Design a protein around this ligand. Structure first.
Ligand SMILES: *[C@@H]1O[C@H](CO)[C@@H](O)[C@H](O)[C@H]1NC(C)=O
Ligand SMILES: *[C@@H]1O[C@H](CO)[C@@H](O)[C@H](O)[C@H]1NC(C)=O
Lengths: 36, 50
């Protein structure tokens, strides 16, 4: 699910995240990391 | 399945009111919203003068 919002820092505003991707089946994922 | 004035979100397929009952469907092939009003039904009373 993703959402992109503009601000002037997590704002106090409210915005629901629209689903966009439902990638097919995988196996157990218990760990992750970001590609810096 | 009649045409409806509702406007779904681009990812939304189901349509539901507050009854846990489907009341709108986005058509897969052509992208339109159709109503799911149930087929008419009701009791049948008989008026007789005896
Ligand atoms: C993660 O999923 C696998 C599926 O093959 C299963 O062994 C189990 O549910 C999990 N593995 C663990 C807890 O070692
Ligand atoms: C599939 O292609 C588009 C995508 O929704 C649609 O307009 C069209 O009516 C569909 N059917 C066919 C036969 O192209």
């Amino acid at each position: 699910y993703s959402k992109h919002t503009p601000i002037n820092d997590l704002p106090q505003g409210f915005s629901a995240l629209e689903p966009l991707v439902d990638l097919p089946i995988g196996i157990n994922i218990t760990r992750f990391q970001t590609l810096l | 399945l009649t045409e409806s004035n509702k406007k779904f979100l681009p990812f939304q397929q189901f349509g539901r009111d507050i009854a846990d009952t489907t009341d709108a469907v986005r058509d897969p092939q052509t992208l339109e919203i159709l109503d799911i009003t149930p087929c008419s039904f009701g009791g049948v009373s008989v008026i007789t003068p005896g």
